Design a protein around this ligand. Structure first.
Ligand SMILES: [Cl-]
Ligand SMILES: [Cl-]
Ligand SMILES: [Cl-]
Ligand SMILES: [Fe+3]
Ligand SMILES: [Fe+3]
Ligand SMILES: [Mn+2]
Ligand SMILES: [Mn+2]
Lengths: 296, 297
């Protein structure tokens, strides 16, 4: 069936021991394809200690026979505005964040990394001229960072669109424009990672909260996915033990409809900090079994 | 009335212009006491750019007539395990995290900073020997960091207990132990900031999920609070337009019962990222109006 994976966001703060985490993904989840989260080792940490730990993960995962296909921004990263921030200095700290995340990913010998693109201030979000001026700087920064990433040995970067009018890209049309702006201008490809819970967010996208609309405008650029359960009313990141609009069969039918091959459906499931480790692990296991029960 | 303040977590990613943020707290929320969040300027950022931005917020708030009483950890910070992490290198990254936060706080001329103490890994959380080993290192770290803070001009550090058995301090008994261990050993005081949603978390604390139990074991050490609305079943951080067990009047009755004076009740309200700016702002204003509506004895 569908190529399933897991983003390690479920394990944040909890199963930190590299061999224990690899074993959990292999033996408990029965999954092979992994996306490593910045929420395990912060790009900003001094590089010696950061990379020592990130490399320990990379080694443990290789040894368990798992494939870390990419690293990706998480909640610590998403807290700040990065490339669409309201000052050049803050946008340059976005450059430096991603530059450092690229270094860490190269230390892991992982081929790709990505993140949401960034976020406008409240004032800037309301001002199209301001948005475009900021964006032009951001777009040039990603050209330079693609070149850097290529020199570090990476093969691809990703941008993850978001369900916010105050950020970019939000809509399938926004993502199409970003992808056109970068295509033929970057030394390695910059592609889209589309999160099902973002695309299906109804309050912002209404009748365009629809994955066919994403394929219509963006199919050729979508290189990977985040999957999660949601009611379409907030970005839930629920597991597949929970009810909502993203049934496992809906996922498998999309997979088959578009003849997908290597565009990993990474489960990106978030738990409240205060949930107990045993309950999170049980839930994650039942959730993966629910996903694997879809009929191809 | 009770001493209300606001933690700037509600503004993260949104009202970032320093004078607009300051004016919003002053004019729209009608408040004076502020807790600045690490979520606006990351302690890890390079010092020069980091302090330029942090200092711009400090100056704008001071000019608007607001008092930034402390800086405090937010979600970016809480993502990591820090002082209770399973390797000494990860613990040392927690040390450096707070050291850098102290640098940023001194640059702002803010007198105090704090955060939750840190977090055990899943394996270590179940090994009392490991917990003890890790904690003894953590405690020694905070001693050194209190010495550094004093040298940088700070007056106080805070630890925020949390509603997880995998972290310490969690219970009022944990918090009393940490406080007792550190009292007389630190060059400036290390005190508790208690979040009403953490103390009132029922699934962990059962009948000890209430604030009188916190005063019974910890009163002398609780120097500030986070207030939020909650149903007591998860750590909600709801605003005071929402139903739940932490009513404005209950907060005012607690404030009067214990003769509190300067121990600021900072509203710490969390909004989904995807909520619209104007909806967050409207709700925050109605929430602060609800809090001000409480009736003092
Ligand atoms: Cl572990
Ligand atoms: Cl703004
Ligand atoms: Cl440092
Ligand atoms: Fe996602
Ligand atoms: Fe809190
Ligand atoms: Mn999301
Ligand atoms: Mn909390």
């Amino acid at each position: 069936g569908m190529k399933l994976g897991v983003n390690l966001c479920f394990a944040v703060k909890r199963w930190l021991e590299p061999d224990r985490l690899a074993g959990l993904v292999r033996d408990d989840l029965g999954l092979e394809y992994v996306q490593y989260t910045y929420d395990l080792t912060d790009p900003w940490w001094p590089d010696i200690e950061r990379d020592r730990r990130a490399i320990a993960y990379a080694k443990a995962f290789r040894k368990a026979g798992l494939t870390i296909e990419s690293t990706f921004g998480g909640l610590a990263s998403y807290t700040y505005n990065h490339f669409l921030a309201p000052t050049l200095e803050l946008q340059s700290l976005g450059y430096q964040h991603l530059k450092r995340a690229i270094d860490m990913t190269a230390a892991m010998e992982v081929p790709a990394t990505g993140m949401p693109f960034g976020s406008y201030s409240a004032a800037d979000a309301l001002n199209p001229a301001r948005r475009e001026e900021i964006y032009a700087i951001a777009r040039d920064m990603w050209i330079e960072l693609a070149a850097y990433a290529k020199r570090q040995g990476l093969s691809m970067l990703y941008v993850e669109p978001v369900p916010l009018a105050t950020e970019f890209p939000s809509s399938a049309a926004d993502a199409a424009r970003l992808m056109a702006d970068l295509d033929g201008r970057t030394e390695i490809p910059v592609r889209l990672l589309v999160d099902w819970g973002h695309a299906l967010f109804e309050p912002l996208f209404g009748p365009e909260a629809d994955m066919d609309h994403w394929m219509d405008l963006c199919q050729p650029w979508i290189a990977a996915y985040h999957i999660q359960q949601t009611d379409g009313q907030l970005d839930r990141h629920w597991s597949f033990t929970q009810p909502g609009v993203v049934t496992p069969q809906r996922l498998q039918d999309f997979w088959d409809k578009y003849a997908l091959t290597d565009q990993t459906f990474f489960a990106e499931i978030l738990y409240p900090f205060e949930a107990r480790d045993e309950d999170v692990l049980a839930d994650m296991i039942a959730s993966v079994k629910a996903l694997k029960a879809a009929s191809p």
